[PDB]
Amino acid sequence: YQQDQVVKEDNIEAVGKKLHKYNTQFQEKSREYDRLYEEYTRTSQEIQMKRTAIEAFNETIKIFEEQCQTQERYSKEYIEKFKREGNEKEIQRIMHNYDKLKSRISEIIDSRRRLEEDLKKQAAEYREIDKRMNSIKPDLIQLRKTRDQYLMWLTQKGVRQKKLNEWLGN
Amino acid sequence: MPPRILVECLLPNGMIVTLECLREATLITIKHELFKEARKYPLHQLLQDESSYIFVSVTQEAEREEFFDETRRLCDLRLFQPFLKVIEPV
Numbered sequence: 001y002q003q004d005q006v007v008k009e010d011n012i013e014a015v016g017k018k019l020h021k022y023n024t025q026f027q028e029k030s031r032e033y034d035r036l037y038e039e040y041t042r043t044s045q046e047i048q049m050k051r052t053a054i055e056a057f058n059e060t061i062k063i064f065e066e067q068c069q070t071q072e073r074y075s076k077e078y079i080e081k082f083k084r085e086g087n088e089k090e091i092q093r094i095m096h097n098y099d100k101l102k103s104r105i106s107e108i109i110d111s112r113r114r115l116e117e118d119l120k121k122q123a124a125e126y127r128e129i130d131k132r133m134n135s136i137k138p139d140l141i142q143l144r145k146t147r148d149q150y151l152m153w154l155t156q157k158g159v160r161q162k163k164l165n166e167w168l169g170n
Numbered sequence: 171m172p173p174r175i176l177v178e179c180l181l182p183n184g185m186i187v188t189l190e191c192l193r194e195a196t197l198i199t200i201k202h203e204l205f206k207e208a209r210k211y212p213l214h215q216l217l218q219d220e221s222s223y224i225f226v227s228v229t230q231e232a233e234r235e236e237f238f239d240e241t242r243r244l245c246d247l248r249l250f251q252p253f254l255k256v257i258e259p260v
Contacts, residue, residue, distance in 0.1 A: 053232065094212045
């Protein structure tokens with residue numbers, strides 16, 4: 001590697017130009033790959049948040065549903081007693097409160113549906129980020145290694161470091 | 171969680187009541203406000219003393235939690251949604 005070699009200078013300059021071209025090319029793909037990787041990561045986290053939140057909706061809905069079973073079974077008793085004493089005001093109030101509970105359940109079920117549909121769209125963006133990334137990777141890797149094949153060859157012919165920096169410089 | 175927030179409480183007589191809370195309030199003072207507020211609602215005679223009851227809710231991690239430690243503050247509970255179901259743990 002280190003010390004200066006006994007080979008034609010013409011061959012070294014041509015290989016050095018190629019190192020340069022292949023480093024530029026590799027760098028371009030890598031920059032491209034990384035921008036996507038950043039959006040890939042943020043998308044993956046948001047997706048994981050949405051799955052958890054769907055689960056919490058599922059469980060929230062169970063609880064409000066159980067509340068519904070509680071009210072039909074507690075107000076079974078008292079409604080039958082009440083229209084015997086003619087209190088249609090208090091029956092009205094119980095029914096109003098019940099309408100409120102069912103209304104809120106349906107708002108929650110609606111919110112879950114929305115999030116399911118947004119998870120569906122975002123999971124698709126995610127798949128498309130992945131396909132773009134997969135299309136680049138093999139290219140990124142192959143350019144890098146050709147760049148390495150040339151770098152190491154030049155390093156081995158004792159080429160000065162300031163000359164290798166000029167070629168890697170862009 | 172802004173300074174004061176609406177918390178939906180699900181009473182064991184079937185009733186829903188909406189209650190304004192200081193985000194900082196402990197569950198024990200909220201249980202207290204709640205059972206005062208319940209008397210303004212139907213079927214308030216079916217309620218035992220407030221101390222027989224415990225709150226249940228869902229955390230942001232989607233787990234169902236029973237809050238036996240009522241000194242805990244409403245803002246530290248990590249509620250998915252501002253509601254509390256009231257149960258006799260039996």
